[PDB]
Design a protein around this ligand. Sequence first.
Ligand SMILES: NC(=O)C1=CN([C@@H]2O[C@H](COP(=O)(O)OP(=O)(O)OC[C@H]3O[C@@H](n4cnc5c(N)ncnc54)[C@H](OP(=O)(O)O)[C@@H]3O)[C@@H](O)[C@H]2O)C=CC1
Ligand SMILES: CCCCCCCCCCCC(=O)SCCNC(=O)CCNC(=O)[C@H](O)C(C)(C)COP(=O)(O)O
Lengths: 84, 60, 395, 216, 347, 127, 134, 39
Amino acid sequence: SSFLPKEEVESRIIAQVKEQNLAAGIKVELSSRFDKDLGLDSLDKVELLISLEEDFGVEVPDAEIDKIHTVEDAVNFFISNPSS
Amino acid sequence: PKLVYDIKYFARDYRRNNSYTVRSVDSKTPFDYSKVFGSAPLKPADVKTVRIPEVMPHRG
Amino acid sequence: MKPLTPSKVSNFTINFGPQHPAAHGVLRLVLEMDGEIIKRADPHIGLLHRGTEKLLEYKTYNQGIPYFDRLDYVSMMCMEHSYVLAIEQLLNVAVPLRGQYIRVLFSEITRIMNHILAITCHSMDVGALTPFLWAFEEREKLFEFYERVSGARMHAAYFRVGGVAQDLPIGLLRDIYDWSRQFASRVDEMEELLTGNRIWKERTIDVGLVTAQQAWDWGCSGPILRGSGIDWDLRKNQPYDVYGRMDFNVPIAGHGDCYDRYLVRVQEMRESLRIIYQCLNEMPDGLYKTPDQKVSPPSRGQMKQSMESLIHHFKLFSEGYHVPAGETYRAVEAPKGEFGVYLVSRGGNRPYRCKIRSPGYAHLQMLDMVAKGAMLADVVTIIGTLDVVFGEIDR
Amino acid sequence: SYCYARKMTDKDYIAYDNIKNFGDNYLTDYIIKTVPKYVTMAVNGPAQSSVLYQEPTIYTTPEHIYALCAFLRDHVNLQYKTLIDITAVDYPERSARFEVVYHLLSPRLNNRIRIKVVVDEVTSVPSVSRIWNAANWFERETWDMFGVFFSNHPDLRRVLTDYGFTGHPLRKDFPLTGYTEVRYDYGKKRVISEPLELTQEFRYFDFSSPWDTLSR
Amino acid sequence: STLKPFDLNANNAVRNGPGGRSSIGGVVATVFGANGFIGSYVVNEISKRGNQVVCPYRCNENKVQPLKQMGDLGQVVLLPEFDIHDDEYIRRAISRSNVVINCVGIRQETKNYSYKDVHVDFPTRLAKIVAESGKVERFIQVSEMGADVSHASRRLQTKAVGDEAIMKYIPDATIIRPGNVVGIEDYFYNNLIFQLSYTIVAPVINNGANKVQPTYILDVADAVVKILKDKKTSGKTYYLGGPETLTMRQIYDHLIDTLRLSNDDTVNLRYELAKMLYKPLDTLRTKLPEFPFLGFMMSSDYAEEQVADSVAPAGSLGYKDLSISPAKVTEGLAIEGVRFIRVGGYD
Amino acid sequence: MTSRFAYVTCQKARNLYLEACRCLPFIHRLHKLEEITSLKEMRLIIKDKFRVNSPVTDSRVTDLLIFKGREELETYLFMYKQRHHAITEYIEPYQIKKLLIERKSSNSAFLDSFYEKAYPLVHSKYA
Amino acid sequence: FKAVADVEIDFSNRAVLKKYVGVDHLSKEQGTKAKFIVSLNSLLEAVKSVPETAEYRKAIEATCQYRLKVCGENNSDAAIEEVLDAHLEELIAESKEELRILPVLLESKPWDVPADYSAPVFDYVDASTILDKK
Amino acid sequence: ATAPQDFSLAMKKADEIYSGKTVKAGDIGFSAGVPLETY
Ligand SMILES: NC(=O)C1=CN([C@@H]2O[C@H](COP(=O)(O)OP(=O)(O)OC[C@H]3O[C@@H](n4cnc5c(N)ncnc54)[C@H](OP(=O)(O)O)[C@@H]3O)[C@@H](O)[C@H]2O)C=CC1
Ligand SMILES: CCCCCCCCCCCC(=O)SCCNC(=O)CCNC(=O)[C@H](O)C(C)(C)COP(=O)(O)O
């Protein structure tokens, strides 16, 4: 179901994740909860999702925002969606 | 003017002589509809009117 | 299996800014229009909000009268009248008959100037400029009466708690009576030029239609009520001065359109002339302000000759009178509608809360309902009939 | 109901005797007995209509305000077709600071009634716009000046204060001069807002007398 | 952030208030050339903080109208009749002043005043008058970056001679040397725009090789404030260049880009030709009054100063010593004025 | 119509922030702010505006704060406020803060305020 | 009142009056006596939903009975207008306006109160009454 | 000390009938909308 290469989208999303003040230093990879591993706040999570909105020209449902929790979940969501 | 040589404000003091009484009203006692509609006219002849007050109160 | 029917969309969210041929003051009006027809009108006010209500709370009762003069620069006397009536009700002060007559007289005079300005500025907004200049000479004649009684042509501050500031100068009643002998002819001259004019008829008929139910629902008062068929006048239904003695007839129209309200305003001018004539003939002699010197200042010779009068003068011009704790709402039939003051007193020398009820606030709220389906040109006429003053709307 | 002009001549009367009596002395008792749940207390005092008469003031709670207003407008005997104004008064000494005041007119009864709902900063008052269309702007003004939220209002926005104003000016804790001031800057060719500075400070003159008794 | 005092003697006594318009700052300033482009912003900065500014001006009520709004009541003093040759008036102007800023300069010559008068004679006489007083504590002179004694252009040479005279008479004076100043009322971008749009051809001296360091007006005004807030700055010359160094060709290209001109209207008017076309026209200027038709650009002095690199010397004082980060003049608010004209979505 | 096979708001502020972020491009285009500021740059300011009100925990006060913030957004969205308002109140201070260079003061916080003014509670202008 | 129309019309016709003052806006129906009787009887039928021993219901019953009486002795429709101080059209609209709020009153049921309900009433005594005499 | 027996009677009675809902300390200050440095 991967519309575009898994390596490219993961590299791009982690590149945008690095841009946030924290969420860096020793652990920027997969299996990292936004609020339980990276110290991100909920508003910071929403802003990062909007930055991915700018990067990948595709919208995210708000209920999906309630569902997304991890770096894996965001890349899976963006690869799944055909507009990508 | 009868106030030149006869000065007594307490007799003519209306500002500080107002008071408020207290009552308690209950739903158990029925309202008197006889007062409201017994005095109401039933025909044009029985109509009574309240005239407009010509002047507001003045001391004179 | 029956086809559905789609509809159309409205755009052109214009901004109609402060515009000189309109009701005086600054109006910012955002209008959403489907083509040339208005679908929503949202008046933006607060451009002349000077914080009047809160300033009153920091001043004594006598120090706050000029606020009411400046709330409505067109009709000063009627605006200060409600404030002084409310303070009188809380103070339980009785006004002498001469002062009551003077208040009624000057209220009718300011009513006439208000109606002159309303009608002629409305005609100017339509585009006729001759009645406007023909009217300023009359309005000057009336401003000279103001400058005679108070020394200020506009912000007299003549009405005071318990009576009037000074007595009528000698010779004033003759001049007012002469102005009255010629006023009817001047009004007839204006009425011929306006009434019966085909362009004026076409511009004003069936514009701004209001029904009696709509007027009561939106809280309108005065000419708006009387142009729709409502026989309601505060001067008659709820008299507040020697207005009860006065003999005059309510003008009534039924359509509710702009033309009906113009006719009502002209007839109101005539009725005010009749009331002025009655006041002139029946003007009593005696005190013009209340005899009580614990609420009104003593006369200057009296303060300069008596110790008690000097004490009262000092304590009235420094501290002011203390108004007993209570609340009251007193309304007057202002030329623009019903103007009321909700005064809350806690027993001090300053008002705790002085809410001002604007007659034009409800009319501007009614603007959207009235100005539905109209054109860009109709907005000026609709605003003219409401006759809104934005210093009066924005306290 | 609606005071449609009926009598062409000799309508000199202020109103009929019975209509005056029912509203001069039976009005408060009639309201309390007819709709007891809505009313908590009633005050008869100096008249709004005139100096000589007396009109009721009813205190009700925020939950019952909509039903009380609907009853007042459409009851056959009491037809308060008009909402004169809506107002709030700030009483910082009380836990429930704000008293939202409703002023009504009955053209048929030639009478005025005053309705008060006592709330605090957090609680909200249901909007009565469906009962009287005039309420919309009055409730918007009350929200702007005092900060009282009105529930189910069609669009609750500030009216009088400047754009971007966050404080509520008529609250007794708000400074008379405010917190900010407006000036044009030459460097930045814009009109800007700055913290307040006063060339001459407001002079409060304390005139209260120890011997006065009217102050409550 | 903590407000820093104006380092003037006995300021601590007089100063009081938050530092705003209605506050009291212990600075009384005589800004010569107040109605000018540079002077108006300096007056705004000094008066904004509650200080009193004396503005001597040659009679022109409409030109000095913006200065009236700058300060509170009695803070901006406008003296009606200013003459550079009148000593008594200069003494009266600086009577109460403890800081004097000189922004008086002429871009072009006329019959009444030459470069040698305004840029040399006035600084020396004013320097003597300030020196004899003693009350004046700070002196600031504004000059160009390219001003040098060994300069072909007469304007930039006379300016350097006047600066040396000022340094001789007042040793503790500070010589502010900004680059081409960008602003709404500037003579840099406005003249370039007028050249590109209402002129038949835009002559560019050589190919635009000459390098320049333009700076924003707010940056120079803040640098003046930082000079006055530090006494250690006295006796030093500050080269207030911009953050980025650009050749004239880059600036012309970027103006063409921002304005979305159809194509390039600039032409190559190489040197040794402007030196022949404008050489008689300088003598024409010296015998005729000020005329809007021809000025500044159409002079040999402008060509001579546009064949050299007006850049800050490597070892030099600048914005970093004053702890100011200059804003870029090709982006942001600085470029809004030219941006409003056309951006290709506009008209 | 049935078979056994047939059948087998703590974050209100987050929603308000999502509304603001989604409406940001519209106010950028409406207020001609493309060149002056970027979408990311405003998204950064909006978070601080939200964070100033963090201490509150009561639901009703939170509701009032959210309603007021929605009003603040609606002013810009409906063109009640103007371009210069957006420049003055959000974009300019953020750009000033980025452009600010300051010397790390060796004096503690008390010493600096003591040198500055007698009453620290009074504000300072043009610091 | 005074008509503001220069045209001369007869106001004793009792229909030209209604056309002039705009009663037709309130209701397009003529508003005869029988319509008033029907409206009052329909209000009486409607108020049956309110419990029998409810003060509101007693009030509506008393008012409807009073107006049915006033209809009784007065055979002229204008006489009813004079006694009730209203046009027949607005008298008819009155009962419908009463009908609109019955649903809102049946949702909250204001008449339900405990048998110890007590509403304190404060009354104002004027100083003019005591000072002049007692 | 006895009683005012005036409008203050209804004032006190309105006081005792009504009450305010409890909120955490300082929460209302945020609702006020004034500068936070005021507190
Ligand atoms: N591009 C720039 O703006 C730069 C400017 N500078 C230097 O700063 C100084 C001024 O900058 P700018 O303000 O742009 O120049 P302006 O010409 O804009 O300001 C000149 C001021 O000097 C006054 N002035 C000129 N000649 C006389 C005179 N003979 N007698 C009295 N007053 C006089 C003018 O008054 P009036 O209006 O009556 O003539 C005007 O107020 C100049 O020396 C300039 O070289 C430094 C770097 C770059
Ligand atoms: C140009 C246009 C700009 C528009 C500007 C608009 C600015 C609006 C400012 C309004 C601020 C508010 O609403 S403040 C909303 C009420 N404040 C609260 O604190 C309630 C609960 N707070 C929290 O949970 C955390 O502090 C939090 C960090 C919010 C985590 O958000 P989440 O609840 O998801 O977890």
